[PDB]
A = this chain, B = another copy of it.
């Protein structure tokens, strides 16, 4: 309702803030990004689908590296992402500066939601309106959704973007705490194909992953996506026969 969404400083009568709710509407408006955690790693997949064949196939870019074992992928305003992830990188380096330790996904998530909240509090600044799914390996795989609100929540597997609801109803049935690494990234391709409702090629998705066993962030090539891409497709076709 009007006048409880004309400021970010104005709490509504209900205790809700309709501005902040409208910044979450911004996150659903965008493109999808799905995060999947398994015990051997946490695999992060993001839509690389373009508006035209006039755009370079890789549009810069949907999965950033933040630390050496920490990545995030994006849904919501791509504008806000530029500054928000830049800030995130400087912070992951700052902890390496001042303790000589790789930052933990809690504490990187924490800095970034605290930074968010400060600009939700002020009425002279409007907050970032993008949600990132920050993934990395600390002592165990971790997967976090940083919300445009300034809230963190840890997930076993998740989604954001336009395909969010579809991939929450999907993982409720399928997701189990036994999933393999390879079957995890595949399960997230299946998810991804459901959201857009079209089949996948390695030219309209981008997968990176975080391995425990390497303890490092790695970026999966299209060439090395190809087997996983076919496998997932058999299942994507079956969901669109339902």
Contact = CB atoms under 8 A, between A and B. Distances in A.
A197 interface: no
Interface of A: 1-19, 22-29, 51-61, 77-80, 82-83, 86, 106, 110, 113-114, 116-126, 128-129, 144, 147, 149-158, 168, 171-172, 175
B29 A25 contact: no
B58 A86 contact: no
29 contacts: A3-B3, A6-B7, A7-B10, A9-B19, A11-B26, A12-B22, A14-B25, A14-B29, A15-B25, A17-B126, A53-B175, A54-B175, A56-B154, A60-B153, A61-B154, A77-B151, A78-B149, A78-B153, A79-B120, A79-B149, A79-B150, A80-B120, A80-B121, A82-B110, A121-B126, A123-B123, A123-B124, A123-B125, A123-B126
A19 B119 CA distance: 18
A116 to B, nearest CB: 7
B11 A156 contact: no
Given A80-B120, A171-B54, A19 B11 contact: yes
Contacts of A77: 117, 120, 149-151
Report the 10 A-B pairs with minimum CB-CB distance, sorted nearest first: A79-B150, A15-B25, A15-B26, A11-B22, A79-B149, A78-B151, A79-B151, A59-B154, A56-B154, A15-B29
A83 B25 contact: no
A15 B121 contact: no
Given A7-B10, A79-B147, A51 B153 contact: yes
Given A4-B5, A10-B19, A79-B116, A60 B152 contact: yes
Nearest to A119: B121
A54 B13 contact: no
Given A79-B151, A155-B55, A4 B4 contact: no
Contacts of A15: 22-29, 129
